[PDB]
């Protein structure tokens, strides 16, 4: 398995992305391209809003929809995402904001001629017309920890994220995600419960957020604290 993974997921990898969707009633399309180091868990994406720009909502709500192959899996945690190749995997997610916005996203991840290919679809509804997202009072995301746990041959994830607001303070949201491998389960080594620490940062933006550069670093670990019961 390691042999396959090292053949397909190189130390350096490029990605190409297409995104289409609606937020409230506003349609849009985005494309991006980027590169990263899958085993070190770092990556950059350069993103263009190619239709429906400038967006009437804060770009921040799209941030998590632009890359699971780029997680540094430490401590021998089996890598569900890198193992999934060459077949690939999908994810599906609902992000629920505490002021009512709901953003669903589904995504397909494939490997084509040594390049990672993302196809993303977005449908967000009920964002308050006079709230911080629609009025663009946001300033990016705090760091987060996602808990991943095996469920039915795939993985699920849970995270709470804090969106920084102008004037200080935060708007909180919750992420519920299902990660599904296209590789047959017999061929997968499933991890137990683990945690992915992340810091996703906006590096550059231009033209009323119709061009955005994002960088992410992601490191997977167990809980490092000692266990009285001998658990990981």
Numbering used by the authors: -3 to 62, 66 to 231
From the paper:
Fluorescent proteins have facilitated major breakthroughs in modern molecular cell biology. They are widely used for studying biological events, such as cellular trafficking and endocytosis, and have contributed to the development of innovations such as multiphoton microscopy, genetically-encoded sensors, and super-resolution microscopy. mKate, a derivative of eqFP578 from Entacmaea quadricolor, is a bright, monomeric, far-red fluorescent protein with excitation and emission peaks at 588 nm and 635 nm, respectively. Structural characterization of mKate under different conditions revealed the pH-dependent trans-cis isomerization of its chromophore, a discovery that further aided the development of mKate variants with enhanced optical properties. Using a structure-informed approach, we introduced a minimal set of two mutations in the chromophore environment of mKate. The first mutation, S158A, has been shown to destabilize the trans conformation of the chromophore, whereas the second mutation, S143C, was intended to impact the cis conformation.
In contrast, the single-mutant variant mKateS158A, which lacks the S143C mutation, has predominately one absorbance peak at 588 nm and emits strongly at 633 nm, giving the protein a visible red color. Mutation S158A disrupts the hydrogen bond that stabilizes the trans-conformation and as a result the chromophore populates the cis-conformation in the mKate variants at physiological pH. As predicted, the chromophore of mKateS158A at pH 7.0 exists entirely in its cis-conformation. The phenolate forms hydrogen bonds with S143 and a water molecule (Wat1), as observed in the structure of mKate at neutral pH. In contrast to mKate structures, residues R197, E215 and several chromophore-coordinating water molecules undergo major structural rearrangements in mKateS158A. R197 adopts a different rotamer conformation and forms hydrogen bonds with E215 and E145, while in mKate, R197 forms a hydrogen bond with S143 and S158. Changes in the hydrogen bond network reveal a cavity in mKateS158A (and GmKate) that is filled by a water molecule (Wat3). The particular conformation of R197 in mKateS158A positions its guanidine group above the conjugated bond between the Y62 phenol ring and the imidazole moiety, presumably altering the conjugated π electron density distribution on the chromophore via a cation-π interaction, as has been proposed for mNeptune. The crystal structure of mKateS158A reveals three potential proton wires. In pathway A, the phenolic oxygen is in direct contact with the side chain of S143, which is hydrogen-bonded to R197 through a water-mediated interaction.
